[PDB]
Amino acid sequence: ADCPPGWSSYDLYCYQGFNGPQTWDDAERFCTEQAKGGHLVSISDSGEADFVGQLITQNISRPEYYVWTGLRDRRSEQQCNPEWNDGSSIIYTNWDSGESEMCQAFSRWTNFREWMNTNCQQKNPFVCKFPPA
Amino acid sequence: DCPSGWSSYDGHCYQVFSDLKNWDDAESFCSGQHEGSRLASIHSREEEAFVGKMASRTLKYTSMWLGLNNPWKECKWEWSDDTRLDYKVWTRRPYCTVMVVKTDRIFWFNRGCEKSVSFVCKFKA
C-alpha cells in the first residue's frame, strides 16, 4: 500500500472518513480536492461495505444517522416518481425543507453497511476514496 | 359541472373527506365515489390553494393524502466516480405524500403509506 498519511488502504484504493458536516455536493467537491481522482466513496462488494462501515465507526464520532456515500440520483428535480396516480406527469411539487431525499448515505442503524436516501442539502460526515499512483 | 358534494375547479371536481384512512384505502375509497376519481394530483399553486381552502372548511386538522405513492420510484442511482452500479443495498418502506395546510403556508411531506390521514378526491368533469 502507498496510501498517504491519514488515509487507510483496502484493495488497491485509499479511504478516509471526514467528520463534516457537509452537504453531499460540498462533500464530493471536498473529496476531489483532497487527492487526485478523489470522490465520495463507492461500494462494489460486501467486503468494501464492511471495511467502510468499520472505518466510519472507528474514525467518525458524529451524532448524525448518516454518512455520505457517492451514490445519488443526479437529476435537478426533487423526486424520482415520474407520474401521479392518475398518470399525469409530476412537475409542480411543494416539498417542505428536508423532504426531498435524492442522495444516499450510510445509515447508523445498519452499522453503516447499508444505504438510505436523505436530503442532499443535509450536512453529514462523509468518506472519500481515490486510487493511489 | 360537478355533482352535489363536490367543488369545481378548472374542469375538475374535488371533495375532501375527514375519515382517517391509509393511502391505499383512501385511493380505493376515491375510486368508488365517482368515475375517474382518485386521490388528487396537484399541478399548480392555484390548484393547491383551491384544495387547501376546501380542507380548511372540512377538516379541523388540515392534512390530506395526495395521489403520490412512493416518491422514490424509478430512481437512477449513480456513483460520483462513474463506477457501475451493481452492488446495491438500498431498501425503503413505502412513503406517501401528505399535503399539510397551515394558516400561513402549505407544504408537502412524506409519511408511511400505512398511516391514517384525511384525504381529497379528484376527477375530470
Residue numbers in the entry:
A (entry chain A): 2 to 134
B (entry chain B): 0 to 124
From the paper:
In this study, we demonstrated the isolation, purification, and characterization of a novel snake venom protein with anti-angiogenic and anti-inflammatory activity, ZK002. In the first part of this paper, we described the isolation and purification of ZK002 and its identification as a 30 kDa heterodimer of α and β peptide chains of the snaclec class of proteins. Snaclecs are approximately 30 kDa in mass with heterodimeric structures comprised of homologous α and β subunits linked by a disulfide bond. Our results showed that ZK002 exhibited potent anti-angiogenic activity, with inhibition of tube formation, cell migration, and cell invasion in VEGF-induced HUVECs, and significant anti-angiogenic activity in multiple in vivo models.
The purified protein showed a molecular mass of 30 kDa, and two distinct peaks with a molecular mass of 15 kDa (α subunit) and 16 kDa (β subunit), results in line with our previous SDS-PAGE experiments indicating that ZK002 is a disulfide-linked heterodimer. Database search showed the sequence of the β-chain was a complete match to an existing snake venom C-type lectin protein (snaclec) of D. actus (UniProtKB: Q8JIV8). The sequence with highest similarity to the ZK002 α-chain was Snaclec stejaggregin-A subunit alpha (UniProtKB: Q71RQ1.1), to which it shared 76% identity, thus indicating that the α-chain was a novel sequence. NCBI Conserved Domain Database analysis indicated that both ZK002 α and β possessed C-type lectin-like domains, a prototypical domain featured in snaclecs. The structure of ZK002 was determined via X-ray crystallography to a resolution of 2.1 Å. In agreement with the mass spectrometry results above, ZK002 exists as an αβ heterodimer. In line with previous reports on snaclecs, the structure of both α and β chain subunits of ZK002 comprised two β-sheets consisting of the β strands β0–β1–β5 and β2–β3–β4, connected by two orthogonally orientated α-helices, and a long loop was seen between β2 and β3 strands. Further, disulphide bridges between cysteine residues were seen between β0 and β1, α1 and β5, β3 and the loop region of β5, and between the two loop regions of the heterodimers. The asymmetric crystallographic unit was made up of a tetramer of αβ heterodimers. Taken together, the sequence and structure of ZK002 were strongly consistent with that of the snaclecs class of proteins.
